[PDB]
From a paper:
Notably, p27 bound to a CDK-cyclin module is the [name] substrate and unusually the binding site for phosphorylated p27 is contributed by both [name] and the accessory protein, CKS126,35–38. Using cryo-EM, we provide an in-depth structural analysis of the quaternary architecture of the [name]-[name]-[name]-[name]-[name]-p27 complex which forms part of the [name] E3 ligase that controls p27 ubiquitin-mediated degradation.
Concomitant improvements throughout the p27 KID were also observed, permitting modelling of side chains that previously could not be discerned. The conserved LFG sequence sits in a deeper, more hydrophobic groove formed by [name] Ile213, Leu214, Trp217, Arg250, Leu253 and Gly251,, which also constitute van der Waals contacts with the p27 Leu-Phe pair. The final component of the p27-[name] interaction involves the p27 310 helix (residues 85–93), which binds through the catalytic cleft of [name] into the ATP binding site.
Residue numbers in the entry:
A (entry chain C): 22 to 93
B (entry chain B): 175 to 432
C (entry chain A): 14 to 297
């Protein structure tokens, strides 16, 4: 089918794809600090950054299964 | 649940103020006008009717935009992106089977790529702080419905119509809390079809009296009386069908004695 | 995989946080519904009987949730305590605590679904908290949420197995009654292999659901009159080590009528809960 009659309708003409992409990207990678420093954890690549918090490695045993439950 | 109903209503009343947009937030926006928000919400309704989406999603979706546009700026071009991402985030909370992203991209006539609808829902979920559960004008009429006689048809459908007509116009419905808009909607359809005024059961439970809804009633009647001449006619067509008792064709009442 | 969890204690006299990682494919539907729903419904809830979602962070392809740390789930604790059995004061404590959390959730418009004993978390202080809220779905009234049959089989209400159109607040009460009746004897009451045998295991104890006890069963879908005429088992044998007070509460909370099952806010004033104090378990 030639696309749905009522729903398929462009609203505000053309847009700038490149500017839109960089605007989204900036803010996407801007989300840092005040949490990366509050939890003093390098959340970008799962790295236990040094600080007051004592990040430790935990085996799957001796721990509730709620913390490593795969999504279903 | 008649055991927990009082507590649920009190919690809803308390939460209705946190999940609220700031009044007059948009005139500050330097690219968009109310004639654009009305168009966006119209398109939202048209999409919702052509995907068999639940009526709770729409009321939720237009809420998120109201809590987004008043917190982070947006240009004219990517407003449809905000609307599409709002529908995507609302349907993944209230619908049993959320539609796929490719379908939403197909809806907007392939102007936004699949990677473009995302990275916006990425943005929306953090400006709202992941507080998606927002009380709205559907969740309040539901509580008020079970006190307008045990059996009364064509009341729980015109009231929904008057609740949905609220979202189209920001001015002046962006001031009243959802609990007052719902109360005005419930006491307009009831007077339209049955005759009885604001029930005594819900004037000692919600605390509102029929005097403290007069602004809401006078705001809602004008929209009721002009809906056939509005520039965005999709909700009227949506409720023209027999699923909702065809109340969209009922004659609006002329005058009130409130 | 290897570092599947990064449990981080605090040095500045703080609580213990744990990291739950969710990997985002970012190819279809964006973030999954099972994450959005849990994140949204676990921030409005703040009770001393619920896990606290301390923090949420969302990166370009990963989503971290910082939870409070609770030592031992109920399943492993009761597996290790099967030899001696759960002491009566301890189960009294673990009932007076979970009922509070369930009542709080129900009064907060949020509905829990799967009260598996693996979804209940205890710690060394004697506290207990509801853990998994992924299947939770806000209702407002029980006539808003539909049916999808996701909850675990051994803890389905007799109304859910037969097929309904809307949930209620009695599903959680039924599951809670099953757990209560199940920790006294340390045996899952109704371990059916499928829905049909689960139904046939339910009827064996509570008697065939005649219209006298259940007004709305005859017209219920997926109900048939070609059902065995099993008797109602005497409760003195279903759970032997219960006191005189506890006879009634297990029977009211295991009732058939979804509008009769005793509400959680009403279960705390039942004469069973008269002298409850919290001891400490076997090192959690």
């Amino acid at each position: 089918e030639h696309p749905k009659p009522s729903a398929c309708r462009n609203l505000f003409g053309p847009v700038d794809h490149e500017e839109l992409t960089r605007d989204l990207e900036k803010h996407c990678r801007d989300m840092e600090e005040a949490s990366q420093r509050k939890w003093n954890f390098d959340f970008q690549n799962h790295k236990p950054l040094e600080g007051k918090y004592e990040w430790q490695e935990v085996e799957k045993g001796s721990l509730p299964e709620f913390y490593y439950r795969p999504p279903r | 649940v008649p055991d927990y109903h009082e507590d649920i209503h009190t919690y809803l009343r308390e939460m209705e103020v946190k999940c609220k947009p700031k009044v007059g937030y948009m005139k500050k926006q330097p690219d968009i006008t109310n004639s654009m928000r009305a168009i966006l919400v119209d398109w939202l309704v048209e999409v919702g009717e052509e995907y068999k989406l639940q009526n709770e999603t729409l009321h939720l979706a237009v809420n998120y935009i109201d809590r987004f546009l008043s917190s982070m700026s947006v240009l004219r071009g990517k407003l449809q992106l905000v609307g599409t991402a709002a529908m995507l985030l609302a349907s993944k909370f209230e619908e049993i089977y959320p539609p796929e992203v490719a379908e939403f991209v197909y809806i907007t006539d392939d102007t936004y790529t699949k990677k473009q609808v995302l990275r916006m829902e990425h943005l929306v979920l953090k400006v709202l702080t992941f507080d998606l559960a927002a009380p709205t004008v559907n969740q309040f009429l539901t509580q008020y419905f079970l006190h307008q006689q045990p059996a009364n048809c064509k009341v729980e459908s015109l009231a929904m119509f008057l609740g949905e007509l609220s979202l189209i116009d920001a001015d002046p419905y962006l001031k009243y809390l959802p609990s007052v808009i719902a109360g005005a909607a419930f006491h307009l359809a009831l007077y339209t079809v049955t005759g009885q005024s604001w029930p005594e059961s819900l004037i000692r439970k919600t605390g509102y009296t029929l005097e403290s809804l007069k602004p809401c009633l006078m705001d809602l009647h004008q929209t009721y009386l002009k809906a056939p001449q509005h520039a965005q006619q999709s909700i009227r067509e949506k409720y023209k069908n027999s699923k909702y008792h065809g109340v969209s064709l009922l004659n609006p009442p002329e005058t009130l004695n409130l | 995989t290897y570092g599947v969890v990064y449990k981080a204690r605090n040095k500045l006299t703080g609580e213990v946080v744990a990291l739950k990682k969710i990997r985002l494919d970012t190819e279809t539907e964006g973030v999954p519904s099972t994450a959005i729903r849990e994140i949204s419904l676990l921030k409005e809830l703040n009770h001393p009987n619920i896990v606290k979602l301390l923090d949420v962070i969302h990166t370009e392809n990963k989503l971290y949730l910082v939870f409070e740390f609770l030592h031992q789930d109920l399943k492993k604790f009761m597996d290790a305590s099967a030899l001696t059995g759960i002491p009566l004061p301890l189960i009294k404590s673990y009932l007076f605590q979970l009922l509070q959390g369930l009542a709080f959730c129900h009064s907060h418009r949020v509905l829990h679904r799967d009260l598996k004993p693996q979804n209940l978390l205890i710690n060394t202080e004697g506290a207990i908290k509801l853990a998994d809220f992924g299947l939770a779905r806000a209702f407002g009234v029980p006539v808003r949420t539909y049916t999808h049959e996701v909850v675990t089989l051994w803890y389905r209400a007799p109304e859910i197995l037969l097929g309904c159109k809307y949930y209620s607040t009695a599903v959680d009460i039924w599951s809670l009654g099953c757990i209560f009746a199940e920790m006294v004897t340390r045996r899952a009451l109704f371990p059916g292999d499928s829905e049909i045998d689960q139904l046939f295991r339910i009827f064996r104890t509570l008697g065939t659901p005649d219209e006298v006890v259940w007004p709305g069963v005859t017209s219920m879908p997926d109900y048939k009159p070609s059902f065995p005429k099993w008797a109602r088992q005497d409760f003195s044998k279903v759970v032997p080590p219960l006191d005189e007070d506890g006879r009634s509460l297990l029977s009211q909370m295991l009732h058939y009528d979804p509008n009769k099952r005793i509400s959680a806010k009403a279960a705390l004033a039942h004469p069973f809960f008269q002298d409850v104090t919290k001891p400490v378990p076997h090192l959690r």
